[PDB]
Amino acid sequence: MNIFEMLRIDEGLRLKIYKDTEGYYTIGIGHLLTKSPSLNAAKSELDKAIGRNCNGVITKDEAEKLFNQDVDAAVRGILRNAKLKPVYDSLDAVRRCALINMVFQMGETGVAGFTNSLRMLQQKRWDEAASNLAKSRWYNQTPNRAKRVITTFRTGTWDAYK
Ligand SMILES: [Cl-]
Ligand SMILES: [Cl-]
């Protein structure tokens, strides 16, 4: 199990524009296109992202190319963030995947907002951080995925994914 396989399980793969859990226009492997209600605002973004006229549809390769960019961007974002970096640095290899997962899903700014949980992870208080992470909109909106990530933070193993 690695970060790629983990996110691919959590996000799925779709070759045609679809709407995410929040109702936003998405494509491929969790690649957010626009928060705009316009399908046209989405087809536009998509062609801009791919560099071709897609007409809302992409190939597997194109979807994986986006996925690669987004994971890389997620990682560099954590490393550049004053709030996130220390946390990441303090963690083992499995738990690091769990933080990258949240960041990919909710953006750097969102996760950086989990002040208390971040502090508990840094202190290696696994159980307490798992409890606090659960008191969030995130967990209430996408409970199965949140539980998986949370379990990963609690245990340090890939159990939740196998
Ligand atoms: Cl709550
Ligand atoms: Cl879910």
Ligand at shortest distance from the CA of 140? 1
- DSSP characters for 57-96? B--HHHHHHHHHHHHHHHHHHHHH-TTTHHHHHHS-HHHH
**Residue 20 known to be catalytic:** yes
Experimental method: X-ray
Local structure of 34: helix, strand or coil: strand
**Are residues 160 and 151 in contact, defined by beta-carbon separation less than 8 angstroms?**
yes
* Resolution of the structure in the document, Å: 1.8
Contact 56, 17 (CB under 8 A): yes
Angle at 31 between CA 29 and CA 37, to 5 degrees: 130
Binding site residue list for substrate: 32, 104, 117, 132
**108 is an active site residue:** no
Question: What single DSSP character describes residue 7?
Answer: H
Domain 1-162 has CATH 3.30.70.260: no
Chain position carrying tokens 């950086």? 112
User: Where do we find the tokens 């979807």?
Assistant: 63
Among 11, 45, 70, 108, the one annotated catalytic: 11
